[PDB]
Design a protein around this ligand. Structure first.
Ligand SMILES: Nc1ncnc2c1ncn2[C@@H]1O[C@H](COP(=O)(O)OP(=O)(O)NP(=O)(O)O)[C@@H](O)[C@H]1O
Ligand SMILES: [Mg+2]
Length: 350
């Protein structure tokens, strides 16, 4: 029911160290708290403390995030629930690193084995493991799209033609969802098939350089895995359930004064910030029990509508930087992520 919200603080990066930035973030997984020194060079004691469902410090390894957050989600999907996990936070704090991850040097590991692997590569591997172990008759279908400047583009369409803006419509046979017309939904039979498709897909997800992040996501990435399951019980009863998992890598809050974003990059930041703002208003509207929730004001919240206050089991991974340089941005991330904890969802099997 209640949306699960966890926070992950990444390690200081080079630029922060070279700028002699100091640490203003303390994570306490035990108490499940994140405290932020809000004082300034003046006050070095005053702290702002938030309590979440789970808190991951700078030493948190990919596998830790997965075992703690994803594994339980994965089983729910197998149960026939609709689930969503999305990474949220300031540009450069670890959303993409967390959702997709990277690859260790010299092929010392296969994708699934890699300690740098993110949530998505691990989940595609695990999905088949659990399904084969389950015994059900199953079919797996995947899709990947990015929301770029309020337009939708399929990232898995293999065609050579330039990608067209996909149109979105409410699902006729389901008032709790949308339909992306023309979106490719590729049937996959094992991790190898999925991995080939995934790396090519994630590779073309619009990424560009900004002073804050040389590898900044210029769009919100939405990777969906739909699983059709059909089994026959010992009672000769045939049950058909459908599970779905949305792994979302959002673009992140960006102060163009700091990112130095110009024209095209600035245009992207404008859309990114506006869409995230709309996400914040949706969250706030749900926590305040407001008569209206502004889902329709952005393609992001339309896609995430059922995930936010609907019949989807949702988990949020708020990513933050430990540097004193990002006090306002960090507080903003923690504040909205904290509010999200109070949103009540009504998950139900399909
Ligand atoms: N937990 C971590 N451990 C090591 N490196 C990290 C970690 N988190 C983030 N990074 C690195 O910082 C750079 C990533 O920024 P990420 O790609 O993490 O930014 P982002 O949140 O996707 N930025 P943005 O797309 O603008 O919202 C990556 O090359 C990562 O390797
Ligand atoms: Mg990114």
């Amino acid at each position: 029911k209640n949306i699960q919200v966890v926070v992950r603080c990444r390690p200081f990066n080079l630029a922060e160290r070279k700028a002699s930035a100091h640490s203003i973030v303390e994570c306490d997984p035990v108490r499940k708290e994140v405290s932020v020194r809000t004082g300034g060079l003046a006050d070095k004691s005053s702290r702002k403390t938030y309590t979440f469902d789970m808190v991951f410090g700078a030493s948190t390894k990919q596998i830790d995030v997965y075992r703690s957050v994803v594994c339980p989600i994965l089983d729910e999907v197998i149960m026939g629930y609709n689930c969503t996990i999305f990474a949220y936070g300031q540009t450069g704090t670890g959303k993409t690193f967390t959702m997709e991850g990277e690859r260790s040097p010299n092929e010392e590991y296969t994708w699934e084995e890699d300690p740098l692997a993110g949530i998505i590569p691990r989940t595609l591997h695990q999905i088949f493991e659990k399904l084969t172990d389950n015994g059900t008759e199953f079919s797996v279908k995947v899709s990947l799209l990015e929301i770029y400047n309020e337009e939708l583009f399929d990232l898995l369409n293999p065609s050579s033609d330039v990608s067209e803006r996909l149109q979105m419509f409410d699902d006729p046979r389901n008032k709790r969802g949308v339909i992306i017309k023309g979106l490719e939904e590729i049937t996959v039979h094992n991790k190898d098939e999925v991995y080939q498709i995934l790396e090519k897909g994630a590779a073309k997800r619009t990424t560009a350089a900004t002073l804050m992040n040389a590898y900044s996501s210029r769009s919100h990435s939405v990777f969906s895995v739909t699983i059709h399951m059909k089994e026959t019980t010992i009672d000769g009863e045939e049950l058909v359930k459908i599970g779905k998992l949305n792994l979302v890598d959002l673009a992140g809050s960006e102060n163009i004064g700091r990112s130095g974003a110009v024209d095209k990059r600035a245009r992207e930041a404008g859309n990114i910030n506006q869409s995230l703002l709309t996400l914040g208003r949706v969250i706030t509207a749900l926590v305040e029990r407001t008569p209206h929730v502004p889902y329709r004001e952005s393609k992001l919240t339309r896609i995430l509508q059922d995930s936010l206050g609907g019949r989807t089991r949702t988990s949020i991974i708020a990513t933050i930087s430990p540097a004193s340089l990002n006090l306002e941005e960090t507080l903003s991330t923690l504040e909205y992520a904290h509010r999200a904890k109070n949103i009540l969802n009504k998950p139900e099997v399909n």
